[PDB]
Amino acid sequence: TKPCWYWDKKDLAHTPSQLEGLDPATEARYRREGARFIFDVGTRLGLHYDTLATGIIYFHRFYMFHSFKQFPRYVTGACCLFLAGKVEETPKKCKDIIKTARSLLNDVQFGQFGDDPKEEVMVLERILLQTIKFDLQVEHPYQFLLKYAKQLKGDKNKIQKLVQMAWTFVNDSLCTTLSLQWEPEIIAVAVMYLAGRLCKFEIQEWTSKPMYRRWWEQFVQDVPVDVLEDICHQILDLYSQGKQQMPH
Amino acid sequence: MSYNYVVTAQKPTAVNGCVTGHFTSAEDLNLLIAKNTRLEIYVVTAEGLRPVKEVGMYGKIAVMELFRPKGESKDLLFILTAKYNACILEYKQSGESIDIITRAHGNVQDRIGRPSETGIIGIIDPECRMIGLRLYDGLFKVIPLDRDNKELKAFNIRLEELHVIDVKFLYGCQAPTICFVYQDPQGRHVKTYEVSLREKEFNKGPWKQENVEAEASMVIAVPEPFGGAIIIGQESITYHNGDKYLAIAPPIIKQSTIVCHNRVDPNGSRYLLGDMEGRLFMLLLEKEEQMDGTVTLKDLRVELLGETSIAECLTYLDNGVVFVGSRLGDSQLVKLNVDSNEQGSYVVAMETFTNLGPIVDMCVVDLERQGQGQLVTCSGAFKEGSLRIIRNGQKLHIRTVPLYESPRKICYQEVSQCFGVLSSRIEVQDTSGGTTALRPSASTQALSSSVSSSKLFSSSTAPHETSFGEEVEVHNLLIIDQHTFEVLHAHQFLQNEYALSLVSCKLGKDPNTYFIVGTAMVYPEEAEPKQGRIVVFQYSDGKLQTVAEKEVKGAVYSMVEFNGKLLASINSTVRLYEWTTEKELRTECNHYNNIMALYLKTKGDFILVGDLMRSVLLLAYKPMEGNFEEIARDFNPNWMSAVEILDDDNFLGAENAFNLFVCQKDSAATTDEERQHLQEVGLFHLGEFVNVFCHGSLVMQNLGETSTPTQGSVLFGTVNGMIGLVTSLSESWYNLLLDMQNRLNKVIKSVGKIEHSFWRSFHTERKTEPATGFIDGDLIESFLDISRPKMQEVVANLQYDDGSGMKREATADDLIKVVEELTRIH
Amino acid sequence: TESDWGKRCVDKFDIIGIIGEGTYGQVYKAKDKDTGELVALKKVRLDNEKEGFPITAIREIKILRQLIHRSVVNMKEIVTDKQDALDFKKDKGAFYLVFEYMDHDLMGLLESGLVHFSEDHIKSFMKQLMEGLEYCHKKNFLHRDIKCSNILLNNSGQIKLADFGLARLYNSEESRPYTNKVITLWYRPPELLLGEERYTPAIDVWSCGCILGELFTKKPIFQANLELAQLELISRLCGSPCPAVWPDVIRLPYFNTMKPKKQYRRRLREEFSFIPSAALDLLDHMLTLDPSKRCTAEQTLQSDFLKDVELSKMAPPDLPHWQDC
């Protein structure tokens, strides 16, 4: 019926990119760049946050089936965003995405688009659709972060701080392979869990069951803490590696 | 775009209705006969009828009634067309000049309504206060007959009884009263209402509802001496009037369904009744006068008088003369005698009026080698079935070959100097367990005969119970000589086998010429036939010999020879068979994208397929590959009745709504999709139901005929006997004739003031479109009949195009020559 | 696996013929070589390369893989033309969307005049359509192109909604700018004629009500060629748009611009007096001018007309027979 779009961390050692001699750090960097490119291009175009995420998810899934050495990331990214716009009903013309991509990319980077940027992108749409197995509907942590937050009752300022901090963590998780490891529902919980620890908030008190120390089990069933910690660790690692610090 | 021309070669002959009254003068008794779109007016004489006037209306005549409102010297005529155009007409004569006056007119169509099952019904009050119309289920429309209602404005009264069978205005009521039979889940009932023009609604009726026969068909309004109504059914006749109820159930009427009634005696003592087998009965109202001075109905009696043609309408004239208006056979004038003849009959035929009847099929064949061509038509049904040989000679010469059974298909085989004709006769289950024919007919009077011995369906194991009295069809192939038209041979097909298709041709390398018949096994239980036979016959030395049989899984609706191969349509499938050296049919290629492949036509390696509901598909045989290819389809949905190929690009179709359309290949190779789309370029409401298209022309060809502007010749036969002709035009000739039509329509006065453009507009219950690509030749040919002042008025400011002179002014004499040349194509 | 769409080739289907022309491509009837199941194949051509894969097809793929209902057409898979080897750029072959073949479409049955609908037949039909619409409306998807041609019917009496090319999600909390002119004029609601642009799911209801009346009359209720003429026809039957019946009508862009000849009174019950009372009440509510007062899909299912209809008894309609030829 529907395809499986989630892998185990150990499996990422065997992507086409890895097996063509690309080392783990480089593929990670290539993904951070492609994601941040999709995010920046669409943000310049004024695109909804779901549209950016959908393009990023297409992008991440794509390179589970292909190698970065044979498919330029910035072309793939532009193609993903182009399709995402049509899927999420926030369409953009391919020429405008190229225009924005050129504004944001240097001369070396834009060389990936070759002599005819639009053609390279439009041609790729065929492979993208076949690669993502025409499974176009994608759910994102954002909707669950809001759906679950709406069930919290308490100080508006204390919660709203939780939501925004978690929202920032969601935007940051788009540069990682978490989208390929855990369903969006778990991600939304993980970012709520992380923000709570950082803000020293005890979320259970706001839940309908205030003695249920496992506050997430009422939103997402069958999630061990280890999963949430694994997700938190990866998100925090991104901040430790970068010069940026936790939003707080 | 495509340009075509359509003319009538023979006007409709079937009688759709007939009434008697004082229409032309308050003194003379007139018989008005209605044929589809044609009104014939006669004056009754002691010998017969004197014709006085014939008008054509731009509409199909559905209602025709004569009424005389207080203050009028003579009867007025009400007519309602099937397109809901209503009008009141008056006959006016000034010396030698006869004209028909339109006193009132309008369109009574409702925006929202469901057309009734039993069709449009129109009745007029005995006091001529209002016209009752039953157009839609659950609604009764009233046109009040006031002097000021020149537009025939009307209102609807809500009617609780949704399924009405028949309704009539009653005599002898204090207020306008309607008596009608209706059907609901509990059976059929008779009920009455009063119509109040002041309140514009129904009031309680004079007498209560009564439960009536399940198949109560007709309501007869009895006149003032008796009052009340008579209800005719299948087995019983009943009289109703308040507390009075009489019912007679003679066994004779049960045998055949009674379809038409008329009043002989103005007081209501005697009524005439006719049934589908042609028997004519006299219904007698036996009077009993009480000492009170009042008159009551004592009893009802039915007496058989004799046999007439199957009659759509009967009307008593005077003396013993009755006009038998027949839609399935020839109409008649018959005299009723007081004394029976030596055979026991009181009916003796006086005159016979030719009715080409339903033209199920026809072929054009040159019997005398003159090059003129003759049209042999399968005409009539049941006892009226006949073969009609028609030739041009200024009137058409028609010869009739009586068959006394229903003819279905005809095809000519020159090698054998004979015709092959498919026919069916009605037999009835009898006490022997078999069936007995009601009368001898062509299939039983053949010189030599044969009965099918095929064992293909012999295994059966499917029970089909038979009840005594039930009807069955028995199908035959008739071999008929082309000179004597004598039935030489008749082959009876299997029990429950219907013959649907017939061809005469040679196949493959076989030098023998065969009759080939496609059949279907028809059982009442099945929705669609699932068994069938393709049979190859050889007529040799006075005997028909079966050469081969091919079993199919469906009905062989249509067959046509295809370059030495046999092209047959079996239900959805369209199949091509090869004829092997072993004299057996061998399948080659099939096409399945059809719902019901009813009709087939071929030109070269191209095939035109007609579907029950998907219009037409252009197929092609690809010899390099040995299979079919879909060239182009008409995606617009149409119910087909007949199709024909005009040329390699234009295709002609006939709809069940009495419309004609012409499809063409879009001739644009830009996209393959454009080529695959057949664009309807011609739309035209013919007003007739076309069953057969046939290439050919009856006009004699001496090789000297001035080459007419029209090119091509397709004849078609219709259900009402009308024969028409379709031909193509050049763009220049079309524009000239089309511009002329628009000029003629402003000049010519229409009966009922019906707009010509509306009449010819494509019309389905769902859609109405303006006509396109068709020239109404009957309108063009009327230019020669309008007065000289009108002729010159028409030609004013008329310019020519694309000719020897780009722009040229036309004169009335110039057009007289052009139209006269157009009248020479038929 | 069954989920890896876009790879299997169209070779696996034997093409029977072209059953219609679709909006993004032509639609073919085909038979699966492996199973023998009849399918309807819809062709999507990206060769134009103006905007790539058509969004209309993207909508249908996105939505129909989410919607699973007896009265909603199922997309079985997506197959492709033999693609070029090693040359992905050169390949211009188009993909085909696979569906189940339905024996007829309502426009074809009604147009031929061959189909006859009894009350019970109309009950089974409308109940299936409204159940499908309720499922879709509960999922917050709007069809936006309800027409007799988009109702496919199997000879078994099963109804399925079919063309989801214009379908989009509806957000009650966030009003969004939408395509004003979505439904075909004959089935378009009065609100869109006046150009709401922020339409409710009730636009689909109005269309289905128009179908309800067309099944009784066998003729489309409101047939016009111009948007103003349609408002006139609707106004004569349903009443002229006025603030009393449509308080917010004054906010609609074209209310002052597009006026009917008169302020007509409502005549629906009078002109449809032949319709059964249980159904006439459904028509009155479905054909309500004010979208906020127009009944919902669930409400129609909970009507005297359709509530007690049992879907087990499909009661197949009187479909063309051999005798009708």
Ligand SMILES: CC[C@H](CO)Nc1nc(NCc2ccc(OCCO)cc2)c2ncn(C(C)C)c2n1
């Ligand atoms: C006809 C318009 C609709 C638009 O939707 N066309 C369609 N008609 C399907 N069947 C009905 C049919 C059957 C035979 C036929 O014959 C033509 C010549 O023989 C024509 C139509 C049908 N079945 C599935 N689909 C879609 C959802 C993939 C369909 N779309």
